[PDB]
Amino acid sequence: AFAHFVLIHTICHGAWIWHKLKPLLEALGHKVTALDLAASGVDPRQIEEIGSFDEYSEPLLTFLEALPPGEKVILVGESCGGLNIAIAADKYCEKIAAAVFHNSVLPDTEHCPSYVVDKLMEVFPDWKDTTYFTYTKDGKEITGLKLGFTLLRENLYTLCGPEEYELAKMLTRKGSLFQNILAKRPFFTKEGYGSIKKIYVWTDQDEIFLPEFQLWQIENYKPDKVYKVEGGDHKLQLTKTKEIAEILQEVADTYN
DSSP: OOOEEEEEOOTTOOGGGGTTHHHHHHTTTOEEEEEOOTTSTTOSOOGGGOOSHHHHTHHHHHHHHTSOTTOOEEEEEETTHHHHHHHHHHHHGGGEEEEEEESOOOOOSSSOTTHHHHHHHHHSOOOTTOEEEEEEETTEEEEEEEOOHHHIIIIISTTSOHHHHHHHHHHOOOEEOOHHHHHTSOOOOTTTGGGSOEEEEEOTTOSSSOHHHHHHHHHHSOOSEEEEOOSOOSOHHHHSHHHHHHHHHHHHHHOO
């Protein structure tokens, strides 16, 4: 079967992280959309204009609104992209055949939207040379960050080529987790987000979303299907592109 995959990058990244996976899925016959979220990739906004993870998710919500009645997509979110999936699922669950988490945060419905992020910060507290700043938007102080190049090299792109790590140094932008905004956000709902099929893909070789955090998430909110990719690193769409396309082909053949 063929499906329409919507690939969703993590904070401080853009559609460009999917440049190896998108031609591979298209060579299997799939339709692929790789979005830039607000103030990400070559999106024209700067992060200081964005006041919440929901506003940050606007390109994804706008894309889903533009789907004609009856067209379903498989969302694929990497790293912080699972939060954009949860936001989208509470507005457009009928348009989502399934959601695939790729070394991703897995929000739940029982605890507040910041829960798995708060736990990530406990498991991975030192972000090395990452720099931080604050700005004010809609009466709230938001902490922005720019991922440090040593953190990028050692923990996110550990086994990626120098030309792939070069793209990350050239293209990663200032972003935000909007952690304090998520903490006061209404909980993700059981009827929207809670209802979609959730496939959790991970590697135990991930150097930032460590095995303790990812296994903690799988136990906290049981996925419908779990795929563990052997080897690779946090950016499995670069180090294990072929294995991620094989898994996504299987999801396309299982959920519609």
